[PDB]
Design a protein around this ligand. Structure first.
Ligand SMILES: C[S@@+](CC[C@H](N)C(=O)[O-])C[C@H]1O[C@@H](n2cnc3c(N)ncnc32)[C@H](O)[C@@H]1O
Length: 224
């Protein structure tokens, strides 16, 4: 795959070189090009440089992470979850699950909130390139959080880095605590669901910044 800003048929110097120089490209070879916004298949026309290609068929850029990415975040005060669902949507979350935690101020979510979150979601995906829209389900209790093939819980009291446990091939389950945070009993209770504690640095982070940090380290970090 090559990088061509705009898919105009003119591969920038760097791209032209590597393909012909290193990869050893010739006239006829069918490769793909993308500019980050769209993509398509091509057929090396002239080696230039710059190498001029022939777009054969417009492709649909891979936008999804690859595995299911569930975000279990505690109900936040105000419209915080609105900023979370947005960033999370553009970060790869394929499903967002609000959680009712001991210290989570709000204990429930009205159809109005669940409405705006879904609105924000279906918009964030649209504005991120994603065609898939993350599912924003009605809140539930921690106890409901099922067993997970893989789970990471942003825990201030942890020593494990995400890049030391993250298994790219297996689905992903994330968990962030409310403004107050997860209760010592809640945390371990999640670990009993398959959630491995993870640190997001040596500074206190808002539930929103925490969900973003965690998410970014499991997708944007791995370049997926
Ligand atoms: C802002 S914290 C609540 C206050 C925090 N327990 C404290 O006393 O420092 C809410 C959530 O943000 C996430 N978080 C914030 N800072 C974190 C950190 N340094 N490491 C891991 N998670 C963190 C966790 O999900 C935490 O439950």
């Amino acid at each position: 795959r090559a990088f061509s800003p705009g898919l105009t048929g003119v591969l920038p110097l760097r791209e032209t070189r590597h393909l012909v120089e290193v990869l050893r490209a010739r006239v006829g070879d069918r490769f793909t090009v993308f500019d980050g916004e769209r993509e398509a298949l091509a057929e090396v026309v002239d080696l230039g440089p710059p190498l001029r290609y022939r777009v054969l068929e417009e492709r649909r850029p891979e936008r999804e992470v690859g595995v299911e990415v569930v975000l279990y975040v505690a109900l936040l005060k105000g419209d915080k979850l609105a900023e979370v669902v947005r960033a999370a949507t553009e970060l790869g979350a394929t499903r967002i699950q609000p959680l009712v935690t001991r210290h989570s101020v709000p204990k429930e979510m009205g159809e109005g909130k669940l409405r705006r979150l879904r609105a924000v979601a279906l918009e964030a995906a649209k504005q991120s390139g994603r065609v898939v829209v993350p599912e924003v389900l009605p809140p539930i209790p921690l106890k409901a959080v099922p067993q997970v093939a893989q789970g990471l819980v942003a825990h201030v009291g942890a020593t494990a880095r995400v890049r030391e446990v993250l298994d790219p091939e297996k689905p992903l389950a994330l968990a962030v605590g409310p403004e107050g945070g997860f209760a010592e009993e809640e945390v371990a209770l999640l670990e009993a669901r398959g959630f491995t504690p993870v640190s997001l640095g040596r500074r206190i982070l808002r539930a929103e910044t925490a969900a973003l940090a965690l998410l970014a380290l499991c997708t944007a970090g791995e370049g997926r």
